[PDB]
Scaffold this active site. Structure first.
Site, PDB file in Angstrom:
ATOM      1  N   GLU A   1       0.812  -1.214   0.000  1.00  0.00           N
ATOM      2  CA  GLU A   1       0.000   0.000   0.000  1.00  0.00           C
ATOM      3  C   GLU A   1       0.848   1.268   0.000  1.00  0.00           C
ATOM      4  O   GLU A   1       0.312   2.349  -0.258  1.00  0.00           O
ATOM      5  CB  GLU A   1      -0.990  -0.004   1.174  1.00  0.00           C
ATOM      6  CG  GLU A   1      -0.404   0.013   2.574  1.00  0.00           C
ATOM      7  CD  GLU A   1      -0.157   1.419   3.093  1.00  0.00           C
ATOM      8  OE1 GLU A   1      -0.723   2.371   2.520  1.00  0.00           O
ATOM      9  OE2 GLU A   1       0.613   1.574   4.058  1.00  0.00           O
ATOM     10  N   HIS A   2       2.144   1.166   0.290  1.00  0.00           N
ATOM     11  CA  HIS A   2       3.044   2.228  -0.136  1.00  0.00           C
ATOM     12  C   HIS A   2       3.390   2.143  -1.622  1.00  0.00           C
ATOM     13  O   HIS A   2       3.429   3.168  -2.306  1.00  0.00           O
ATOM     14  CB  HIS A   2       4.301   2.209   0.718  1.00  0.00           C
ATOM     15  CG  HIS A   2       4.140   2.908   2.030  1.00  0.00           C
ATOM     16  ND1 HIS A   2       4.272   4.274   2.159  1.00  0.00           N
ATOM     17  CD2 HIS A   2       3.823   2.442   3.260  1.00  0.00           C
ATOM     18  CE1 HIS A   2       4.078   4.616   3.419  1.00  0.00           C
ATOM     19  NE2 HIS A   2       3.797   3.523   4.106  1.00  0.00           N
TER      20      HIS A   2
ATOM     21  N   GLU B   1       9.384   6.605   8.491  1.00  0.00           N
ATOM     22  CA  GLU B   1       8.075   6.655   9.122  1.00  0.00           C
ATOM     23  C   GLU B   1       7.912   5.622  10.222  1.00  0.00           C
ATOM     24  O   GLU B   1       7.049   5.800  11.076  1.00  0.00           O
ATOM     25  CB  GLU B   1       6.961   6.515   8.085  1.00  0.00           C
ATOM     26  CG  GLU B   1       6.869   7.732   7.174  1.00  0.00           C
ATOM     27  CD  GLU B   1       5.655   7.725   6.267  1.00  0.00           C
ATOM     28  OE1 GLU B   1       4.899   6.732   6.273  1.00  0.00           O
ATOM     29  OE2 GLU B   1       5.454   8.724   5.544  1.00  0.00           O
TER      30      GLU B   1
END
Ligand code: HEM
Lengths: 101, 54, 439, 55, 49, 414
Positions: free
Chosen positions: C59-60, C136
């Site tokens: 999903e990145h 992140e």
């Protein structure tokens, strides 16, 4: 009837005693958390006058010295100022009990 | 909240027997304090019955 | 006007099953928008030890190359049609959805289909997004709350694939490949396991055959073991932080019980408090009333989170170290008060809060269609609001005290502590406070 | 089989305490008879009940 | 910090019936609780007698 | 549900905007233009105090009854505010809207503000201000509005650091007396019928500012955070103008929050200019506020400590090279579609749609349907685009920056 009830009340207020120690109605009330809450909800200057009356009364009962004739607090010149405060404390405590039950 | 943290006796019992921070290290060699205390009250009890018949 | 008046005119959300293992759902009414999304049952639960965090990685990497467009022109198409795009991946599900307008529905379906099935990969893009996900993770050092919930999962599901982290550990971030990732995408996101939902100013026929044109042709053709709760204690002593986060959970039922309905009533009774609320000493929630009366914490949420037919019936409270024990003890007292002396008006208020909160939870189109996708994955269906209200009225205090007898009373919880947590009581104090001999 | 007994008589602590009191007097009965049988078995003969029965 | 955590395992210490991450434990809790509370109750019977 | 809204402006002064549908989420809004632009210099922070005063006793309905009945029927009550507007939003079902309406009327129009509760609310004000300004960006906006006006649009959402514990409820009594007319009130209903609201608002209340001057300058807040937060704003236009719509189109050109999560915003020219220039972590955005007399417009940067002035210079020269008559008509159509998408998709959710309908009905005191607003979006051309951009580039400046300030240009060195 009422013209004689005032005579009984003034006799009882003479024989009560705290008219001679310079006190009033709101100076002798026995306390729970509710009456101390009513004390907490007071204006500042009235609270100052109440604590000064209390401290004079405790001093004059410490050397057991009743005030002279000049400062015996007369009947019906005293304020029943805690009546709205204590009355709303009554209503709020009864509201809590009668609503949660 | 609780009786245990607002009652003047259970403050003392809470600070002596319950919320006492104990070290997590002590072996059975440290058991002899409570055993001395229990032996002390047991001696008080047996001696008191002796005192009722002496 | 009654709930019959409000529930006689109510949206319907017709569904169908396209002939490849595809499911489709439509929330058809009069709103001038569309939320068109793909819900696929893929997360960190289905993953393996080497494929840990590959889904978060997907999903990145779902936007840095398709076989039909490059990356900048793709999202430039998303911009030029004047729309909005979002995606996420939990431990179990994954949603790629588009908040668009009704006059760009077919182009939305087309570009969304290329997004789903035919991504293209780069060595530059795998390197750039590897750096972004490492930074992140170092930024998810800061969000204490999901650190606490990841501690909670990792200590309550020790040994299962469910206790795998949402994003994957840092070596398992920095070591993966393209071949493993294509094997991942080819095993999980393909034929049976996908719900195309859409909500808004739409129809069924054009939408139907557009999905048939763009999403079909796949025809792909062995996971999801049952889990195990443990109940244990993990703590992260860090004595510099100004606040402590303490959460504790027991094994809830999951999705497939009316126990879910009963515990939603109970965690509508206790539920939420934050220390910015209006009216402090006159609170309705009695736990919150005490917690304001003596400042016994700062905030809490007491709730339930369901994985696939298993549950974390949980509480999460943030406080200072000076009053951890007091909030802990009154929490256990309120659980046992539900367990034994469940009165009437608290059950009535719990049902009313459940009604109003579920209605306001069904607001807009994007949360409602999110509820649609999450319902058609787990339940196999979307529950009508009349069925919700019927199951609300089908529980009184008896079912509540039975469910609290089954799930709260004298079980083995799991504790996650973070911060200034030295004055947390030890685990046996929690257990010997879990059951009443009436104290 | 242990879980069935936990389901029966280990949950409500009042009935728990009452049933272990019931088991305690059960144990009183069984334990006194066990102690009496064992002590008479290791002192067969030289006990006053034997000699008194012979008197 | 938190994502790099593997919880160390207690394979040596658990009961040999809950050593399966496949196996569910809604029901097997009552056997364990019955065993431990059996010990506590029998000890309490001895103490009170 | 094909039936539509009903406007009724009762000529004692108030606005009833009803919408009867068969919807569950019965929401009642009461909107009053009584925000932070109606204080004066003496009672700063009073509006914040009133905003946290939604849980105090009234004449006959004590606060205990209020909180217990409202959270006993399950309906939730929130209060929000902009610098013009205060908003009382009660959500429930169609179960007990009458008693909740009566509580709402008592909360508005029976002020007592008892004194001990006022002191507890002072402590609550310190709590609320800490929880608000733990986001530095709202403090950047507050310094920004402090940097642009000498007048009513310079005040705060919140209270200053010294009036906390020093604001008296007599100020609240007189402020409610001279700022709550019937001529400003908007009762906005979703779920209940028009005649019931008509009866309530007809029989139940029946009781009864200062404009903007530009100031200019900058405000620097040396804070040591490794995050230079810098806003550069000039005054733009009033609200309700095609000029203001042109500023809206212009900021959709310049760049807003991303449409795509984890995207790049390639149409955003400002991010493109700083991307071409700077190779660092940063973010660049636009900013536009607009109110019933004036408004503010500019850009808004978040950057590194040693990488502040380059970001500032790149974005400012990008705005200049678009303002030199050098643009793209596909970007004009793209901004028209993005503004259409923004207004049409900020109005789905019943809270936001309620707020938008009530504010659009109250703001100039006249409802406007969205379709003719889309038409007015279709009507504004490139002439006022380049005119407003030339006015912004060749106008005055206002700056608000916070954080470390090692390399921050002031006004001249943009
Ligand atoms: C205050 C409670 C106590 C009472 C009332 C008490 C009373 C007595 C009495 C009446 C006797 C004489 C009976 C006898 O000698 O067999 C006795 C003996 C004795 N007591 Fe205590 N006693 C008490 C506590 C203790 C304690 C705390 C100790 C020390 C551990 C102790 C040590 C002894 C000893 C060594 C004897 C001698 C036993 C013997 O020689 O027969 N007593 N006590």
């Amino acid at each position: 009837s009422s013209k004689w009830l005032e005579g009984i009340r003034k006799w009882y207020y003479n024989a009560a005693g705290f008219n001679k120690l310079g006190l009033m109605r709101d100076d002798t009330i026995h306390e729970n958390d509710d009456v101390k809450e009513a004390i907490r909800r007071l204006p500042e200057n009235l609270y100052n006058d109440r604590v000064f009356r209390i401290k004079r009364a405790l001093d004059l009962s410490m050397r057991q010295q009743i005030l002279p004739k000049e400062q015996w607090t007369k009947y019906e010149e005293d304020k029943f100022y805690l009546e709205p405060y204590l009355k709303e404390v009554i209503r709020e405590r009864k509201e809590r009990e009668e609503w949660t039950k | 909240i609780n009786i245990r943290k607002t009652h003047p006796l259970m403050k003392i019992v809470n600070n002596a027997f319950i919320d006492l921070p104990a070290p997590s290290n002590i072996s059975s060699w440290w058991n002899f304090g409570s055993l001395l205390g229990i032996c002390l009250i047991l001696q008080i009890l047996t001696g008191l019955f002796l005192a009722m018949h002496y | 006007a009654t709930y019959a008046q409000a529930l006689q005119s109510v949206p319907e959300t017709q569904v169908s099953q396209l002939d490849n293992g595809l499911r489709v759902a439509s929330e058809q009414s009069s709103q001038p928008t569309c939320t068109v999304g793909v819900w696929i049952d893929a997360g960190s639960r289905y993953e393996t030890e080497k494929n840990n965090g590959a889904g978060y990685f997907v999903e990145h990497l779902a936007f840095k190359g398709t076989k039909n467009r490059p990356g900048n022109a793709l999202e430039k198409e998303v911009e030029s049609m004047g729309a909005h795009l979002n995606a996420y991946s939990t431990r179990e599900h994954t949603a790629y959805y588009i908040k668009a307008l009704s006059k760009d529905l077919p182009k939305a379906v087309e570009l969304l289909a290329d997004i789903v099935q035919n991504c293209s990969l780069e060595d530059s893009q795998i390197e750039k997004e590897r750096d972004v996900i490492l930074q992140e993770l170092q930024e998810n050092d800061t969000s204490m709350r999901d650190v606490v919930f990841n501690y909670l999962h990792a200590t309550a599901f020790q040994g299962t694939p469910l206790a795998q982290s949402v994003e994957g550990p840092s070596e398992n971030v920095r070591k993966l490949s393209r071949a493993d990732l294509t094997e991942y995408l080819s095993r999980h996101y393909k034929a049976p396991r996908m719900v195309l939902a859409a909500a808004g100013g739409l129809e069924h026929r054009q939408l139907l055959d557009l999905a048939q044109k763009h999403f079909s042709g796949l025809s792909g053709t062995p996971t999801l073991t049952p889990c195990r709760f443990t109940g244990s204690e993990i703590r992260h002593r860090e004595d510099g932080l100004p606040l402590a986060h303490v959460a504790i959970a027991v094994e809830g039922p999951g999705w497939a019980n009316p126990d879910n309905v009963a515990l939603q009533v109970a965690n509508a009774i206790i539920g939420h408090y934050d220390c910015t609320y209006g009216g402090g000493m006159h609170l309705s929630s009695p736990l919150a009333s005490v917690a304001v009366t003596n400042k016994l914490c700062q905030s809490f949420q007491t709730f339930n989170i369901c994985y696939a037919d298993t549950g974390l019936l949980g509480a999460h409270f943030v406080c200072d170290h000076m009053s951890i024990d007091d909030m802990m003890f009154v929490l256990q007292g309120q659980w046992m008060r539900l367990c034994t002396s469940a009165t009437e008006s608290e059950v009535v208020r719990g049902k009313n809060l459940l009604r109003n909160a579920l209605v306001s939870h069904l607001d807009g189109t994007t949360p409602v269609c999110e509820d649609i996708g999450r319902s058609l994955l787990t339940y196999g269906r979307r529950i009508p609001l009349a069925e919700w209200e019927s199951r609300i009225a089908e529980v009184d205090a008896r079912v509540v005290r039975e469910v609290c007898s089954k799930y709260f009373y004298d079980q083995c919880p799991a504790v996650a502590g973070f911060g200034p947590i030295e004055q947390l009581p030890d685990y046996n104090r929690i257990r010997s406070g879990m059951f009443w001999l009436r104290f | 089989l242990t879980a069935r007994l936990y389901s029966l008589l280990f949950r409500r602590t009042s009935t728990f305490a009452l049933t272990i009191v019931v088991g305690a007097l059960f144990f009183e009965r069984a334990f006194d008879q066990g102690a009496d049988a064992i002590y008479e078995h290791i002192n067969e003969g030289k006990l006053w009940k034997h000699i008194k029965h012979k008197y | 910090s938190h994502t790099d955590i593997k919880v160390p395992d207690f394979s040596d210490y658990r009961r040999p019936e809950v050593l399966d991450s496949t196996k569910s434990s809604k029901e097997s809790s009552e056997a364990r609780k019955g065993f431990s509370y059996l010990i506590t109750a029998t000890t309490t019977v001895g103490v009170a007698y | 549900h094909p039936q539509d809204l009903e406007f009724t402006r009762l000529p004692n002064g108030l606005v009833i905007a009803s919408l009867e549908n068969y919807a569950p989420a019965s929401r009642i809004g009461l909107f009053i233009k009584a925000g932070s632009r109606y204080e004066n210099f003496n009672n700063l922070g009073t509006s914040h105090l009133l905003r946290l005063a939604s849980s105090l006793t009234t004449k006959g309905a004590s606060s205990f009854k209020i909180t217990r009945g409202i959270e006993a029927v399950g309906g939730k009550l929130s209060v929000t505010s902009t610098r013009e507007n205060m908003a009382y939003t009660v959500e429930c079902l169609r179960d007990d809207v009458d008693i909740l309406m009566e509580f709402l009327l008592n909360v508005t129009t029976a002020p007592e503000f008892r004194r001990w509760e006022v002191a507890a609310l002072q402590s609550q004000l310190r709590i609320d201000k800490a929880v608000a300004f733990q986001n530095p960006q709202a403090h950047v906006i507050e310094n920004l509005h402090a940097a642009a006006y000498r007048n009513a649009l310079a005040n705060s959402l919140y209270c200053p650091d010294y009036r906390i514990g020093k604001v008296t409820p007599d100020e609240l009594h007189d402020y409610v007396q001279n700022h709550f007319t019937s001529a400003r009130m908007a009762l906005i209903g979703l779920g209940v019928s028009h005649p019931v609201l008509k009866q309530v608002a007809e029989q139940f209340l029946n009781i009864r500012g200062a404009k903007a001057k530009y100031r200019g300058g900058e405000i620097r807040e040396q804070n040591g955070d490794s995050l230079v937060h810098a806003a550069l704003v000039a005054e733009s236009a009033a609200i309700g103008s095609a000029e203001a719509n042109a500023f809206s189109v212009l900021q959709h050109v310049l760049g807003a929050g991303p449409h795509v999560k984890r995207g790049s915003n390639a149409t955003s020219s400002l991010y493109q200019a700083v991307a071409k220039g700077v190779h660092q972590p940063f973010d660049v955005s636009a900013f536009n506020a607009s109110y019933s007399d004036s408004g503010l417009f500019g850009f808004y940067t978040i950057s590194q400590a040693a990488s502040a002035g380059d970001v500032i210079k790149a974005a400012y020269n990008q705005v200049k090279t678009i303002a030199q008559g050098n643009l793209s008509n596909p970007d004009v159509q793209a901004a028209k579609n993005k503004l259409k998408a923004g207004y049409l998709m900020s109005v789905e959710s019943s809270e936001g749609f309620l707020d938008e309908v009530g504010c659009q009905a109250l703001a100039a005191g006249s409802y406007t349907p969205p379709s003719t607003v889309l038409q007015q979006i279709d009507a504004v051309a490139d002439a006022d685009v380049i005119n407003a951009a030339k006015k912004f580039v060749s106008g005055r400046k206002s700056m608000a920056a916070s954080g470390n300030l090692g390399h921050t240009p002031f006004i001249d060195e943009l």
